[PDB]
Amino acid sequence: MKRTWQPNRRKRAKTHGFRARMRTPGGRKVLKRRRQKGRWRLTPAVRK
Amino acid sequence: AVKKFKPYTPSRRFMTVADFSEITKTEPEKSLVKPLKKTGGRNNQGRITVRFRGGGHKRLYRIIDFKRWDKVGIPAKVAAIEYDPNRSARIALLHYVDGEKRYIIAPDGLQVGQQVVAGPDAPIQVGNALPLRFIPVGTVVHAVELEPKKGAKLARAAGTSAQIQGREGDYVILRLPSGELRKVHGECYATVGAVGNADHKNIVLGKAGRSRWLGRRPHVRGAAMNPVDHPHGGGEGRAPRGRPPASPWGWQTKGLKTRKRRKPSSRFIIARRKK
RNA sequence: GAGCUAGCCCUGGCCAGGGUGAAGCUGGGGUGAGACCCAGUGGAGGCCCGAACCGGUGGGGGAUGCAAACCCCUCGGAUGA
RNA sequence: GAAUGCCGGCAUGAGUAACGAUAAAGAGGGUGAGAAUCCCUCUCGCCGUAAGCCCAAGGGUUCCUACGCAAUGGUCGUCAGCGUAGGGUUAGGCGGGACCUAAGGUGAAGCCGAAAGGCGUAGCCGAAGGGCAGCCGGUUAAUAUUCCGGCCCUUCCCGCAGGUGCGAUGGGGGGACGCUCUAGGCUAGGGGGACCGGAGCCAUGGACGAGCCCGGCCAGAAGCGCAGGGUGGGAGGUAGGCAAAUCCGCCUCCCAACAAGCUCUGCGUGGUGGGGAAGCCCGGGUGACAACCCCCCGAAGCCAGGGAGCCAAGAAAAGCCUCUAAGCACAACCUGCGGGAACCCGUACCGCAAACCGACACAGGUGGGCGGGUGCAAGAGCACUCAGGCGCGCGGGAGAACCCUCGCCAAGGAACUCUGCAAGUUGGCCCCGUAACUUCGGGAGAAGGGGUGCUCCCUGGGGUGAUGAGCCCCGGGGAGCCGCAGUGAACAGGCUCUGGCGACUGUUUACCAAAAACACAGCUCUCUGCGAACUCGUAAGAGGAGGUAUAGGGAGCGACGCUUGCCCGGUGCCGGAAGGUCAAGGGGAGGGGUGCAAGCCCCGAACCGAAGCCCCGGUGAACGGCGGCCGUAACUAUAACGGUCCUAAGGUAGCGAAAUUCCUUGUCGGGUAAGUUCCGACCUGCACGAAAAGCGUAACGACCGGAGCGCUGUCUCGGCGAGGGACCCGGUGAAAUUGAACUGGCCGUGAAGAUGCGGCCUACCCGUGGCAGGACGAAAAGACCCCGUGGAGCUUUACUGCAGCC
RNA sequence: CGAUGUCGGCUCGUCGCAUCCUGGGGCUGAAGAAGGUCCCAAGGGUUGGGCUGUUCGCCCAUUAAAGCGGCACGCGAGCUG
RNA sequence: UGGGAGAGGGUGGUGGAAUUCCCGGAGUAGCGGUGAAAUGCGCAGAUACCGGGAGGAACGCCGAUGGCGAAGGCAGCCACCUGGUCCACCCGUGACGCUGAGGCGCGAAAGCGUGGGGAGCAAACCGGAUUAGAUACCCGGGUAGUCCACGCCCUAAACG
RNA sequence: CCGAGGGUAGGGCCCGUGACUGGGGCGAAGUCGUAACAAGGUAGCUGUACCGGAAGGUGCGGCUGGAU
Ligand SMILES: CC[C@H]1OC(=O)[C@H](C)C(=O)[C@H](C)[C@@H](O[C@@H]2O[C@H](C)C[C@H](N(C)C)[C@H]2O)[C@](C)(OC)C[C@@H](C)C(=O)[C@H](C)[C@H]2N(CCCCn3cnc(-c4cccnc4)c3)C(=O)O[C@]12C
Ligand SMILES: [Mg+2]
Ligand SMILES: [Mg+2]
Ligand SMILES: [Mg+2]
Ligand SMILES: [Mg+2]
Ligand SMILES: [Mg+2]
Ligand SMILES: [Mg+2]
Ligand SMILES: [Mg+2]
Ligand SMILES: [Mg+2]
Ligand SMILES: [Mg+2]
Ligand SMILES: [Mg+2]
Ligand SMILES: [Mg+2]
Ligand SMILES: [Mg+2]
Ligand SMILES: [Mg+2]
Numbered sequence A: 001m002k003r004t005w006q007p008n009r010r011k012r013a014k015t016h017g018f019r020a021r022m023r024t025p026g027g028r029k030v031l032k033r034r035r036q037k038g039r040w041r042l043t044p045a046v047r048k
Numbered sequence B: 001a002v003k004k005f006k007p008y009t010p011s012r013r014f015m016t017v018a019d020f021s022e023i024t025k026t027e028p029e030k031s032l033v034k035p036l037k038k039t040g041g042r043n044n045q046g047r048i049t050v051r052f053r054g055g056g057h058k059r060l061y062r063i064i065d066f067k068r069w070d071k072v073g074i075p076a077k078v079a080a081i082e083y084d085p086n087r088s089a090r091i092a093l094l095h096y097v098d099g100e101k102r103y104i105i106a107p108d109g110l111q112v113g114q115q116v117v118a119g120p121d122a123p124i125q126v127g128n129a130l131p132l133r134f135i136p137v138g139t140v141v142h143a144v145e146l147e148p149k150k151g152a153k154l155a156r157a158a159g160t161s162a163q164i165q166g167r168e169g170d171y172v173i174l175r176l177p178s179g180e181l182r183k184v185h186g187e188c189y190a191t192v193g194a195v196g197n198a199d200h201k202n203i204v205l206g207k208a209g210r211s212r213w214l215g216r217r218p219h220v221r222g223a224a225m226n227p228v229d230h231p232h233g234g235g236e237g238r239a240p241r242g243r244p245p246a247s248p249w250g251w252q253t254k255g256l257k258t259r260k261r262r263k264p265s266s267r268f269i270i271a272r273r274k275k
Numbered sequence C: 001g002a003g004c005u006a007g008c009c010c011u012g013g014c015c016a017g018g019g020u021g022a023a024g025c026u027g028g029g030g031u032g033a034g035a036c037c038c039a040g041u042g043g044a045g046g047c048c049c050g051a052a053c054c055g056g057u058g059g060g061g062g063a064u065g066c067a068a069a070c071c072c073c074u075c076g077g078a079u080g081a
Numbered sequence D: 001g002a003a004u005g006c007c008g009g010c011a012u013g014a015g016u017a018a019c020g021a022u023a024a025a026g027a028g029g030g031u032g033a034g035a036a037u038c039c040c041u042c043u044c045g046c047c048g049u050a051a052g053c054c055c056a057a058g059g060g061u062u063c064c065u066a067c068g069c070a071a072u073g074g075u076c077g078u079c080a081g082c083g084u085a086g087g088g089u090u091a092g093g094c095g096g097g098a099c100c101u102a103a104g105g106u107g108a109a110g111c112c113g114a115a116a117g118g119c120g121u122a123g124c125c126g127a128a129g130g131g132c133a134g135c136c137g138g139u140u141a142a143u144a145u146u147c148c149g150g151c152c153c154u155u156c157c158c159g160c161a162g163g164u165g166c167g168a169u170g171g172g173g174g175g176a177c178g179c180u181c182u183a184g185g186c187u188a189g190g191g192g193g194a195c196c197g198g199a200g201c202c203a204u205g206g207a208c209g210a211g212c213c214c215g216g217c218c219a220g221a222a223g224c225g226c227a228g229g230g231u232g233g234g235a236g237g238u239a240g241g242c243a244a245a246u247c248c249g250c251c252u253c254c255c256a257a258c259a260a261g262c263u264c265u266g267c268g269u270g271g272u273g274g275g276g277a278a279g280c281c282c283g284g285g286u287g288a289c290a291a292c293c294c295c296c297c298g299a300a301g302c303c304a305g306g307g308a309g310c311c312a313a314g315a316a317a318a319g320c321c322u323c324u325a326a327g328c329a330c331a332a333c334c335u336g337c338g339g340g341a342a343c344c345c346g347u348a349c350c351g352c353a354a355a356c357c358g359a360c361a362c363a364g365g366u367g368g369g370c371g372g373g374u375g376c377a378a379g380a381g382c383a384c385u386c387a388g389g390c391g392c393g394c395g396g397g398a399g400a401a402c403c404c405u406c407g408c409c410a411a412g413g414a415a416c417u418c419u420g421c422a423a424g425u426u427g428g429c430c431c432c433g434u435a436a437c438u439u440c441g442g443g444a445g446a447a448g449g450g451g452u453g454c455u456c457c458c459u460g461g462g463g464u465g466a467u468g469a470g471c472c473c474c475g476g477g478g479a480g481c482c483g484c485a486g487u488g489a490a491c492a493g494g495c496u497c498u499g500g501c502g503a504c505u506g507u508u509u510a511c512c513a514a515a516a517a518c519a520c521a522g523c524u525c526u527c528u529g530c531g532a533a534c535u536c537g538u539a540a541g542a543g544g545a546g547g548u549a550u551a552g553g554g555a556g557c558g559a560c561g562c563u564u565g566c567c568c569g570g571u572g573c574c575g576g577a578a579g580g581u582c583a584a585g586g587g588g589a590g591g592g593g594u595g596c597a598a599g600c601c602c603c604g605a606a607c608c609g610a611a612g613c614c615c616c617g618g619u620g621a622a623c624g625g626c627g628g629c630c631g632u633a634a635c636u637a638u639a640a641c642g643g644u645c646c647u648a649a650g651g652u653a654g655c656g657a658a659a660u661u662c663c664u665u666g667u668c669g670g671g672u673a674a675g676u677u678c679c680g681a682c683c684u685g686c687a688c689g690a691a692a693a694g695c696g697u698a699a700c701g702a703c704c705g706g707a708g709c710g711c712u713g714u715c716u717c718g719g720c721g722a723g724g725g726a727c728c729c730g731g732u733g734a735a736a737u738u739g740a741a742c743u744g745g746c747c748g749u750g751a752a753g754a755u756g757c758g759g760c761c762u763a764c765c766c767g768u769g770g771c772a773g774g775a776c777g778a779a780a781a782g783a784c785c786c787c788g789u790g791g792a793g794c795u796u797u798a799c800u801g802c803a804g805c806c
Numbered sequence E: 001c002g003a004u005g006u007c008g009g010c011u012c013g014u015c016g017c018a019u020c021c022u023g024g025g026g027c028u029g030a031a032g033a034a035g036g037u038c039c040c041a042a043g044g045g046u047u048g049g050g051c052u053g054u055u056c057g058c059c060c061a062u063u064a065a066a067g068c069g070g071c072a073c074g075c076g077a078g079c080u081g
Numbered sequence F: 001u002g003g004g005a006g007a008g009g010g011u012g013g014u015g016g017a018a019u020u021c022c023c024g025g026a027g028u029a030g031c032g033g034u035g036a037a038a039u040g041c042g043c044a045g046a047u048a049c050c051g052g053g054a055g056g057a058a059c060g061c062c063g064a065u066g067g068c069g070a071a072g073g074c075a076g077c078c079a080c081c082u083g084g085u086c087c088a089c090c091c092g093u094g095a096c097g098c099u100g101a102g103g104c105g106c107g108a109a110a111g112c113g114u115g116g117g118g119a120g121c122a123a124a125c126c127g128g129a130u131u132a133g134a135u136a137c138c139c140g141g142g143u144a145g146u147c148c149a150c151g152c153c154c155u156a157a158a159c160g
Numbered sequence G: 001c002c003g004a005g006g007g008u009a010g011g012g013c014c015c016g017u018g019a020c021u022g023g024g025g026c027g028a029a030g031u032c033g034u035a036a037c038a039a040g041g042u043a044g045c046u047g048u049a050c051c052g053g054a055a056g057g058u059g060c061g062g063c064u065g066g067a068u
C-alpha cells in the first residue's frame, strides 16, 4: 500500500530548509542547537 | 412557476428548478464581474469558523449598485435581466444614458425596455430609488439603506419587501421582512417595489447532491456524536437530549435570546418581530 | 510534524463500450379556445449493464507471510455527494 | 548466579523450514582453473491496454567500455545495478529562469499584541494555469527537436527605406474560460488491392499460379486549393470609463449582413531534403535506379475562441491591439529589408520498477501520453498473436500420508450446517413473452421460452463514389450439410414467494464491525435588523458574507402518505417598570482611641442602592410525565355502568409475544412427515406509542430473518486424477524456545492433575517419515476480577475555580 | 491471574455399570403370546430426520434397542465459531 | 335598429362604522359574567372616558312581501372587462325547431394540498359552573378553520 | 406438415373452505343512560368536520318537514 515517505524536493526544502528555520524563533533555536551539537549539516539535504 | 420533473429517477421525483422565465441574457457583463474568493468557512487563521461549508460550484461576483444616490437625476434603461449565483434575487442590467453600466437587484415586475431613475423627485414607480422621506406612506419598497449613504442593507432576498408605515421627524417607520417595526432615517435610500423571484421559496432541492452543488456540506447531528464533541453526544443506543438542548458550544438553542441588551439601535427597534 | 491520513482552497487531468429514452420541438387528432392523445424527433438522469479507475461483500489461502493488512476466486460504485 | 537485568561472545532448535508468484524448459557450440546458472545458435513456452514504447516525479552515475570475483546476488557465476579504472550528458526554438498572475505566502502605508510575535492595502513572490520562436533524417560504445544535413522561425541592437501625432506602470478592448450532447471537413491510425517494387521458394499428395512471402512512405517556406474560426462600415452628439482621449460605453442617422470583404488557424499540394522490407552474405552490406500508387474504415485528436441544450451559472494577470498625458515632434513609433547580437540551469541512466515509496534485487504502492491485428454485437472486455520484451537468480530426482489450487464422479439431491458456508446452476446477443403491486417512472433482464455453425440460391436499403463498378455497413426470403454439442475455445445473471430494518444514490470504525450506524432531500422549533447572531483570536483582524429574514447560525426529526392526543406542579427558556432579598458605593443615629487643645484616627444603626434569586404569568416538534383498589348485566364468563383513593395529568389514534414479551417453544391458525425459527392472528404490552416521532409505504439493499424451484461432493460417503509442496540427492542455510537432563506405564503420594517420590509393571543402543494426548507445551509480567488513599477519558442539580456573559 | 482457552458441535476413541437391546435366570396378581419386578452379565450393539447455538427436550419415520455416566462439563499446539 | 332595469359574473381600486391590540393622557376599586354564580381579569393600576397607531373581516340605514342568475348563489362605493334578459319598430334569414343516453362545464358549507393572512368568531381542547353523572346545554379561555391566491374535493332538506 | 393429448411455465374468472375479524338480522319480561316524538324540556332535520361508553355533542353552511 501507499507508505508514508513520499519524497518531494520542493516540500523538503520549503518545510525543513535553511530559510524556513531562520524565519521563526523556534526554527532559529533549532539551528543554534544543531550548531552547538556540531552537526555536519544543519538542515536536510535536498537537490533543488 | 418552478418547473417539476417526471419521476424518472428517485430524486427527480421531488426536485424542482426555477423557470428562469424572466432572464433575458445568459452570460454576465465582463466589466462588472470579479473573482469570488471561496472561503470554505475558514477564516484568516485557516480555522473553520462556519461549519459544513465548501465545494460548491465556481462563481464570479457581479458588482451590484447598492448606493443609487451615486447618479441622482440620470435615467437608466433596463437592458437585461440576468442570473446571479451570489444571491437569491435576479439582477437587472442598467445602461445609463451616461453610457455607464451597472447592476441592480431586479424588483418584481421590472421590464427590460423601461427607464428607471434615482433621486428625491423620481416617479413613484417600480425600480426608482428615492430618499425614504419622499416615498408616500404605504408604499412597499426594497434595497433599503439602514443609515444614510452607507448602502442598501435591508430587504434584498428574493421576493422580500419593507412597507412604509408612517413618519416621525427625520425617521420613517418600516415593517421589515421579519415583521419588526424599526425606525430608519428619511435620508436613507430605497427602491420602489418588492424584490423579484418570489417563487424562490418554493424550490425543492430534491437530493443531497444539489446541496453539495450549493457549497453546503453535510450537517452532523449533535446527538450522532460523542461527548468530547457535543452536549448531545454519547448514550447507549439512542438518547433524548437529556438536558436543555444545546449548540456544540454549550449555550441553549431553544428560545435563548441573543441580541445584545444595551445595543444602541434598541432606541430604534419599535416592535420586535412576529410569528 | 498534514511528503501518512482528514477537510477545505487554487490549478490541471481522467471516466472503453453498450442499454434505457424525461422535458422540449414538430406533425397529426381533439376543442370555442384548451387540457389532453398518438407518432416522430430529441438526448435528460446522485438512470441501467460493464472495463479503466475508485472500492473492500462473502469464502479460501497466507499467519517466523511475497506483505507489520498481502494473494486467489467473488462482489459494490463507475457523469457523480 | 539469578533483576523477562546491560554489553558482547558462542551455543540449541538443524543440516531442519526456507531459497519470494506453477510463464517452462531442452540441446549444440564457445569461454574459462571452475559452467544447470556467462556468450552464441536452434527448438520450446510466457506478456502483448503489457510483462512493449514515451514523459513527469523520485533516485543520483546506477549509463558506456576495459579489467576483476573477497564481499554483495537467497544456489552457482567466467555474469552483474558489485570492485578498480577510463570515457560519456553539447540547445536563441524542448523544459525552467532573464515574462504573467492563482490559492497561498510575504508585505512601504496602516492596525494590534508583556517580550517572542499576530494582522494587513498596494506591491513583491508563488504553476503542471496564461504567454512565447523547430520539424524530418543522419551520426556515437555511450548525447541528440541540443552535434551534423535539409528546409524554417523568434527576440534584441544598429543602419537604410517608406510611412505615422509619436509617446504609459494611465483609459479601454482582448486574453477570458462550466457541464452534457454535437455538425461539417480534415489528420493520426488501420484494413484491402487481380496495381507497383523485391532476394527467393514449389516441399510430402496437389499447385509455376490473378501463387506464396515482403514492402509500397516521411518532413517541407512562399503561393495555390479545401475546410474552419475571429471581425460590421460611416457619420453627428455625448455629461460615463476617478486627468486626457479621435479609443471604449450610451443615443441618433445612413449603408452593409445566412453573404461578401479583411484577418487568423488546420489540412492538402508544394521548390527541396530524406527513408526504404523480407531474404541472402560477414550492427553491417546487398536487395535497389527499390517501388513509393488505388480503394475502403476512421478518431476521444485538429480546424476551435465551432454549434445546441441545460442550471449548479462556470480564475487572474501579462503578452497583444487601441486611446490619449506628461513629454517630444533632429525625436519617437509602425512596416519592409540588411548586418550584428542572443546569457544562466537541466539534458547520462532506471522510471508499474532489481535503480522510485515499502529495512530486502520485497507477489504490495506510484500521475500523464502511445498502446497494432483477427474473431467474439460493441469495447481499452476476452482468446491468440505483431513490434518489442520476457521464462520471474537454486537445481536434479521421486510419484507416500497430508496440505494447497484444480478436474471428474454411479444412485440420491441440502439428507450437510448456526447458515446451501463453499461450490454447482444460470450466463452474450436476437426474437416471442412477462404477475401482484405502484409514487404510473417502475416492478422488468421479472418469470419462462425459441434462436445462434456452415454451403448454395434469390433479394431489400444505406455509406463512398458518379447515379455505375469495387470496397464497406445494416438487413429479408428459400433450399441444403455435418457433429454429442454451432455466443462448439475464452470473457458474460441462478430464479421466485414472504417478513424486519433503513425511503432512495451516497458515508464510516486506514489494519477484526459497511450495518439497522452517519449523511441525505424534506418537516418543525428557535436564535439573528446587520458593526447580525454565531464562531476562531489576548487584541487587531478574520470567517458569517462583499450575504441581509424567500437570508444566516443552532437543535431535533429524517423521501412520501395518513397523523402526531392529555399534563406547565418541578427543571429550562420567554414575559413581568409592583413587592421581597441582595455587593461595592452613598448616608452618618450613635459610639471608640489619642492629644492640654484645634485636630488626627477608627467602628458604625436607619435609610437610598443593579444584575441575580424569590414572587406573578406564558411555553412541549422545550427537559420530561402520562394511576390504584372494590363492586356491577336474568346460565356462566366478562363488565358498557358505578364507588372511592391519589395525581400536574393519568397513554389518545395507531400498533403489539414485536430488532421491545420475563413467565415463553404463550394460544390458535398456516407452511412441514415432523417447524424453540418463520408468516398470519389474539391481547394480562414484565417493560409499544405518536418529530430520542406513531402506523404504512412503490422502488432501492454485497444489510438480517423464513420458504420454494433449479443445481450441485455440502452431505449419505467417499473414490480417482492433475499440478505446486511435503519425500530423496547436490548447493545455501534461519527461527521462536532453551535451569540442567542419563526425560517410560499404572496405582498411589505429594502445595490438592508426577518422566524426576513410593510400590509394582514394563523397557537392548541410535535414528527417519508421520499424529498431536502430555510435558499444567510456546507466545504476550491476565484484557475478566479484585486490590493501590495509582492514572487517564467521560458526566453531572459533587466541590472549587476559570473563560464567557449579565 | 510473569495466562490451566471458556458452551455446544464435528472427529477420534476409551472406560465404569446403577443394563437400553441382545445371552442366562428366580418371583408373578406367569394359561398362551405379551408384560411387570428383581438377580447374573460390559462381548457386541445402541438408526435417519424437523426445531433451536443449544446441552437438554419435544416431535416425525423406523428399531432388537434407540442406556446412563466418567475421561480438564474427554478431545480448539485436531477442526469449527 | 333604438332602448331599459338589475346584490348577474370576473379584475383592480377604495370609504365609514364597529371589535381587538399597541403607545400617550386622565382616573381608582372594581370589572366581567350568570338563573344565581364561579373561573377569569384588576392597586404590577383593570373597568369606564379622551387623543394617536396598527390590522383583519363584514358591509348599517337604503332594504322591501324587492331585484338578478341555470342552479349553487349574488349586498359599502368607484372604474374596467363580460353574460343573460325585457321592451318598442315588424326591417333581414325562411322551420334554421324541441328534447337530449353518453360527453363537457358549473356546482353552498365543510374538508384536502402549497404559499399567505389572522381582528372577530370558533370544531377540537382546557378551565368554571349545573348535575346522580354532564365526555352537554350556560360562563371564561382557546387551535384548526372562517379570509386571499392557485389547485383538488363534487356533497346537501343542491327544495317549489 | 398438421394433429388427440401429454409435459413445462406464467396469467384470468368462478366456486368451496380458513385461525381470527367487521358489522347486520332476529330473539316474553338483562345493564347504562334519555337522543327523538309537546317549544320533548338546548326547535328539529341536514351535508360535512371534529370529539365522546352509548345514544349523541359541538362547529360551519343549508331546509321548514319548526313552535310561540
Ligand atoms: C495471527 C498472529 C497473532 O496471533 C493471534 O492473533 C492469535 C489468533 C491470538 O489471538 C493469540 C492466540 C492471542 O493470545 C491469546 O490471548 C488471550 C487474551 C488469552 C489466550 N490464552 C492465554 C488463553 C492467548 O492464547 C494473542 C494476544 O494475539 C492477539 C497472542 C499475543 C502473543 C500476540 O499479540 C501476538 C504477538 C499476535 N500478534 C498480534 C495480533 C494483533 C491483532 N491481529 C490479528 N490479526 C492481525 C493481522 C491479520 C492479517 C494481517 N496482519 C495482521 C492482527 C501478532 O502479530 O502475531 C500473533 C501471534
Ligand atoms: Mg494509504
Ligand atoms: Mg503524495
Ligand atoms: Mg517538487
Ligand atoms: Mg510541495
Ligand atoms: Mg511553511
Ligand atoms: Mg525554506
Ligand atoms: Mg526570537
Ligand atoms: Mg534571537
Ligand atoms: Mg548525521
Ligand atoms: Mg564538516
Ligand atoms: Mg533542521
Ligand atoms: Mg419534480
Ligand atoms: Mg409521471
Ligand SMILES: [Mg+2]
Binding pocket: B019, B020, B021, B022, B023, B090, B197
Ligand atoms: Mg427568473
Ligand SMILES: [Mg+2]
Binding pocket: B030
Ligand atoms: Mg477584467
Ligand SMILES: [Mg+2]
Binding pocket: B037, B038, B039
Ligand atoms: Mg475571503
Ligand SMILES: [Mg+2]
Binding pocket: B044
Ligand atoms: Mg490572510
Ligand SMILES: [Mg+2]
Binding pocket: B049, B050, B051
Ligand atoms: Mg458553525
Ligand SMILES: [Mg+2]
Binding pocket: B040, B041, B042, B048, B049, B050, B051, B052, B053, B054
Ligand atoms: Mg466549513
Ligand SMILES: [Mg+2]
Binding pocket: B082, B083, B084, B085, B087, B088, B089, B090, B091
Ligand atoms: Mg439569481
Ligand SMILES: [Mg+2]
Binding pocket: B086, B087, B088, B089, B157, D547, D551
Ligand atoms: Mg442570498
Ligand SMILES: [Mg+2]
Binding pocket: B146, B147, B148, B183, B184, B185, B188
Ligand atoms: Mg437609520
Ligand SMILES: [Mg+2]
Binding pocket: B201, B202
Ligand atoms: Mg422551503
Ligand SMILES: [Mg+2]
Binding pocket: B056, B057, B058, B085, B213, B214, B215, D312
Ligand atoms: Mg453554488
Ligand SMILES: [Mg+2]
Binding pocket: B219
Ligand atoms: Mg440544511
Ligand SMILES: [Mg+2]
Binding pocket: B219, B220, B221
Ligand atoms: Mg444531520
Ligand SMILES: [Mg+2]
Binding pocket: B222, B223, B224, B225, B226, B232, B233, B234, B235
Ligand atoms: Mg450519538
Ligand SMILES: [Mg+2]
Binding pocket: B224, B225, B226, B234
Ligand atoms: Mg456514537
Ligand SMILES: [Mg+2]
Binding pocket: B228
Ligand atoms: Mg477532539
